[PDB]
């Protein structure tokens, strides 16, 4: 983009690495900083952000964090625990900020993020996208309204290969509305439906689930009473709903340096 | 309406009687022949035809057959099949032909009404609707066409009190796609997906059941390929899709006194 | 129900009057206290709350406020202005707190209304649907985290008699947007596309319009960005959701003698 | 996939090239046998299928028709039209069958393409989705049944960048419709709804149109009666759609030498 913030992509040719660079160029006051990438790398030196289209940006592939540790302000990973314990440790050095999506941490792992965000501001999270966590919180304030006398229920589409039911945003839906009524989802989630069974038990969180083609990620809560119904759906269309929430916590990050935060923290979930 | 063809309602304070009438009054070549009620009937004798709404239509609720076994042309029964067998040997006898909407007879019961039908043009079906019986003829076009590359799902949703996952509607779609594809439901329905379960079986048919509020009932075939999706979906929103087939087999029933025939044959799906 | 607070249902034989009384019946904590017609009624004296179905409840219909002015606490009226103000000035004068979703009323009317408050405990709203108010009010929480990027567009569908586009719920989504964003529905709304028209301009409100059938509400407002799109979708079944909303406003008077509320009040919209 | 026919997709590095890459490398039957692109070429020689991720696929990509004109059966082209007129000639020439996909050609332009069907089996086609012309078809089999009561509306969702209004699948859509009916799109669409607008006119098809984000493509068409609706949608996700379509016409080709068909010979609709 160019603008006040300046931003490096670890995992440059990496599934997401390519639309972090697209979202980075497209959101303003973000500016592309720097975009790395593995050694081996063939987009090495040269390849400079055109994998997001947008033909040349000025920014080049590297493979070192010294040989541009001055291109950037913040720094954004979605690459591998081990890589992440490394951009980690560096960041914490030069004072360099971190939006971290990178999954799979063991506990060790956490704490060193933890640790780390004592002297450096880090956005941590599970889930990038906003339309989720905006959703998540909506779901509550639903909940506080109308759940009580409602039937809720909750459907979600995947594509063929999902090979959990139902998906985490599914079980994280059922669980916000859930502590939302004060109860536990577990004393009323009702997985699945067939045969003969009798009527639908009051206070019951049904879930349904959709697998089939491509369907990249499709969510809906619904609120169901004699009369009428509220829906609250989330369909995601790309791996960009990721790498959006990704950037916008980056030029969160802007003038902080405190500790650890996460979507809700970006979000200002809390006061919404 | 008053038009050409003339009906008689049977069962006229009952759920499918009120709308039988509205039914009735609005489809155009078809008119209210005779509205029928139950001896004990407070509606009797007179409070005719103003169940449909449409103040005062002519027509008085009456109790005998033979009081009026001459103002009426086609005989519409959504009562019990102990009324059914009573309005059957009556219709047989004056030549009437008879549109059976009643469910529950026991096998003494349909012999009876197919022998009725060696003399008589009977409509007998287990379900009125139109959209219904087009959409299942249409899926088995699109089975045809798409059935093999495509993940086909189905998913319903029916009001809190509805007792069987799947819906018969439901089990009715699923059993007209694998019959296009000459397999057998049976050996492909998916009804629950719960907890690890890994990557969806390629050819199979799996059922997702929504169960909430007053849903008069929803049912959703899709054909999920990489890249698309078709949908067709049918919604009812009242009993009056029951009704208004009704009536169309009422009018089509005009001008046959054969046998038996079922919504295929007042619908000329056989043909579409 | 038979519940700590009472209610009267005036218009007791009417479209509402029907609902009103089987939602009387069916909440908890608020019982049926008495059910008026008009003079002329032939529901008169008798036909006690069958009307909602559950046979015998009771309660009885009558003529008179006085006949029966101390079988309620609370007055629901769903009538016309002329009765309205009837009910209005026997209210006060007993202390009887109302409900009134009458609509229509001239100025002289409301000033009625609000002048009668400073002595009873009403709640007057246009629209007494739970969801509709929910769903309004999460409009703008989410409209403050997204309004920014996304393209929001609303799309409503209603029965084929509506003769206005779009209906007043679609524009008062319109509004909450609009305000939350501090901008002006006037000055960015697009009611229409039709022919060429350029690409669609950022910051703007379209409104998409479907006229169908006998369709009784349909209501959703789509928060789009690149990668994903929130939906918040409102489905009116029947004209139970106002019956349902405004007995829960009865119910929430009790112990209120205050002012002048609406559904926010009832609703605690605003700390939600 | 390697299998009894071989294709060749020219335009190898561009938007189709990349997904026709998938796609026959993706298809039991049909076998990727070249993949061409443009002189100045950086993926030429070599890169060999390698856009469509699958590492290595054996064949590599070419500059010159008669460098590989024996590697394939048939050729698939979404280029340019002038490109188109190369390739025609030499398929021509070779009795290479074709499937062409490149629009924009000029009256010219298809007579060419008419002509060389004399001696050459093409396949072209203004939208190679199967799902949208599978959808066309079933369209007017439900409009054949229903379209003389039902209420019909068609409902299209596209990207913020889309220009016109509706879209040509749309007018597609609503021209199957009109023609099942024996009526003119011209005499009966409605395009737009705003402001004070009595009822829906019977007979007319009203057109909803939504613009927002990224949205790929989304279409449905309404049968809309009292009591019920029945709704095709097709929704497109990826431009993958268009390529697996090109690919099954390869596939079909395949013992063709005759003339000029299009997605209803491949797909049979005709016959459905
Ligand atoms: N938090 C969220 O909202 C979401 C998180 N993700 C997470 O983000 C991460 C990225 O996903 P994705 O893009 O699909 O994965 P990919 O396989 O696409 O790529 C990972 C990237 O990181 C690089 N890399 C891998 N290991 C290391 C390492 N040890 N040191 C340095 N660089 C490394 C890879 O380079 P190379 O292959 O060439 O070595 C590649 O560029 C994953 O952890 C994923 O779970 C994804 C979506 C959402
Ligand atoms: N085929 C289809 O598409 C569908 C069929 N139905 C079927 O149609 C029938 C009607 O349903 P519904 O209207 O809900 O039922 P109801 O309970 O509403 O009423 C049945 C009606 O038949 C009358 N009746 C009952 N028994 C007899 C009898 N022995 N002789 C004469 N009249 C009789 C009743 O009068 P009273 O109570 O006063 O004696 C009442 O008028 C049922 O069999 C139902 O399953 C419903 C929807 C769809
Ligand atoms: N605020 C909201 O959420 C909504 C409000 N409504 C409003 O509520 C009202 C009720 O609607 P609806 O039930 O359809 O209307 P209806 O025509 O169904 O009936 C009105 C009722 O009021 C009675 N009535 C009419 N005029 C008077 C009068 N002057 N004095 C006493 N009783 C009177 C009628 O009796 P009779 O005919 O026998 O004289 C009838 O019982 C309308 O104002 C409507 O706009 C409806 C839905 C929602
Ligand atoms: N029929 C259908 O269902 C659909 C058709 N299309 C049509 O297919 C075509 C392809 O679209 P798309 O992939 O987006 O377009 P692109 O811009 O992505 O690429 C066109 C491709 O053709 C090559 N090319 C362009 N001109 C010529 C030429 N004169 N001779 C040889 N090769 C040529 C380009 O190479 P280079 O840039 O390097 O020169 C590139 O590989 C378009 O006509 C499009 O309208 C797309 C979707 C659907």
Chains 1, 2, 3, 4 share one sequence.
Request: glycine letters at 12%; charged letters at 25%.
């Amino acid at each position: 983009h160019d603008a006040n913030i300046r931003v490096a992509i670890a995992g440059a040719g990496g599934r997401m690495g390519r639309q972090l660079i697209q979202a980075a160029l497209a959101l303003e006051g973000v500016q592309l900083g720097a975009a790395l990438e593995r050694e081996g790398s063939s987009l090495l030196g040269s390849d400079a952000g055109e994998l997001a289209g947008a033909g040349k940006t000025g920014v080049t592939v590297q493979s070192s964090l010294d040989a541009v540790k001055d291109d950037f302000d913040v720094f954004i990973d979605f690459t591998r625990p081990e890589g992440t314990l490394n951009h980690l440790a560096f960041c914490r050095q030069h004072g360099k900020g971190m939006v971290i999506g990178t999954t799979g941490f063991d506990e060790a792992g956490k704490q060193a993020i933890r640790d780390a965000a004592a002297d450096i501001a880090i956005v941590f999270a599970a889930n990038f996208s906003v339309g989720v966590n905006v959703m998540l919180k909506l779901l509550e304030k639903a909940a506080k309204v109308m759940g009580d006398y409602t039937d809720i229920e909750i459907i979600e589409a995947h594509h063929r290969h999902k090979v959990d039911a139902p998906s985490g945003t599914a079980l994280a839906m059922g669980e916000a509305i859930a502590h939302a009524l004060d109860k536990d989802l577990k004393d009323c989630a009702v997985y699945s439906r067939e045969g003969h069974t009798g009527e639908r038990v009051p206070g019951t969180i049904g879930f349904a689930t959709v697998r089939a083609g491509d369907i990249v990620g499709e969510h809906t809560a619904m609120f169901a009473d004699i009369g009428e119904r509220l829906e609250i759906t989330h369909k995601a269309s790309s791996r960009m709903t990721f790498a959006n929430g990704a950037v916008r916590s980056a030029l969160w990050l802007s003038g902080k340096e405190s500790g650890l935060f996460d979507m809700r923290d970006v979000l200002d979930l809390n006061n919404l």
